[PDB]
Amino acid sequence: TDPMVTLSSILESIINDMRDLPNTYPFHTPVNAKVVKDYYKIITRPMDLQTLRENVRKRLYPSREEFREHLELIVKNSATYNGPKHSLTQISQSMLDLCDEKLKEKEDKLARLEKAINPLLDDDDQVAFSFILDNIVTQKMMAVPDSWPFHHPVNKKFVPDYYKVIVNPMDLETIRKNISKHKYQSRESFLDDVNLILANSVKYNGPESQYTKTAQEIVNVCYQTLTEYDEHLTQLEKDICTAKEAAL
Ligand SMILES: C[C@@H]1COCCN1c1cc(C2(S(N)(=O)=O)CC2)nc(-c2ccnc3[nH]ccc23)n1
């Protein structure tokens, strides 16, 4: 019994339960951008329950976390466009709350399916590797003075032209999310994402900007810390590759 199918049935059931909450209809289908004419000038990642359900049916979500991240976009988008206390945002939050209740009820089953879909989520070398990477991000990289521009995705509401310049955005929160999902099996992919932050700062702010000097320091402290842990990380990467091959 394909665990991806079972998982998808649980996620669809959660969508059914949130669709049934009061006043949720404005979130059942995509915003009509020909009626809400400025919507895409403000919102970068539109999401709604129908798109979410179709993605569940396409087997696009191998775990709770990718599903929840897309569901959370509904709330974040409403908070940005409608307002943090707007009634619509409260309604969307009520759906995220119901999702979290249901995920809590089924966490052991969901964990088992997730491990069967991707055995690396249960591999102690992958877990230790991701733990080290997360600590580099939170304890070294986010500690660079005035690194705040790079901690979270740019909000197009506050920097309206940002995404006309930066089409491949990256930030430390997204990296932490990638780490939490165990996206990185070695330092190469992690450094691809770290360096994208710096490349985007060069492109948007300029090579001589103070923003770019800060981003350069973020990248440099990443290299310095990876070098300090090189030998353990090398052991973890070798054993992760071996686990990955055995999962075949
Ligand atoms: C564009 C600059 C330089 O490159 C990197 C991004 N960085 C940012 C990033 C962010 C956010 S966010 N969630 O606010 O969008 C924190 C994640 N905000 C601003 C901002 C917002 C309003 N007024 C501003 N004046 C000067 C800057 C500024 N700038």
UniProtKB/Swiss-Prot annotation:
Signal peptide: none annotated. It is found in: Nucleus. Phosphorylated by casein kinase II in vitro. The TFIID basal transcription factor complex plays a major role in the initiation of RNA polymerase II (Pol II)-dependent transcription. TFIID recognizes and binds promoters with or without a TATA box via its subunit TBP, a TATA-box-binding protein, and promotes assembly of the pre-initiation complex (PIC). The TFIID complex consists of TBP and TBP-associated factors (TAFs), including TAF1, TAF2, TAF3, TAF4, TAF5, TAF6, TAF7, TAF8, TAF9, TAF10, TAF11, TAF12 and TAF13. TAF1 is the largest component and core scaffold of the TFIID complex, involved in nucleating complex assembly. Belongs to the TAF1 family. It is linked to Dystonia 3, torsion, X-linked: An X-linked dystonia-parkinsonism disorder. Dystonia is defined by the presence of sustained involuntary muscle contractions, often leading to abnormal postures. DYT3 is characterized by severe progressive torsion dystonia followed by parkinsonism. It has a well-defined pathology of extensive neuronal loss and mosaic gliosis in the striatum (caudate nucleus and putamen) which appears to resemble that in Huntington disease. Intellectual developmental disorder, X-linked, syndromic 33: A syndrome characterized by intellectual deficit, delayed psychomotor development, delayed speech and language, and characteristic facial features. The Bromo domain mediates interaction with histones that have acetylated lysine residues at specific positions. The second domain also recognizes and binds histones that are butyrylated and crotonylated. Component of the TFIID basal transcription factor complex, composed of TATA-box-binding protein TBP, and a number of TBP-associated factors (TAFs), including TAF1, TAF2, TAF3, TAF4, TAF5, TAF6, TAF7, TAF8, TAF9, TAF10, TAF11, TAF12 and TAF13. Interacts with TAF7; the interaction is direct. TAF1, when part of the TFIID complex, interacts with C-terminus of TP53. This is Transcription initiation factor TFIID subunit 1. It comes from Homo sapiens (Human).
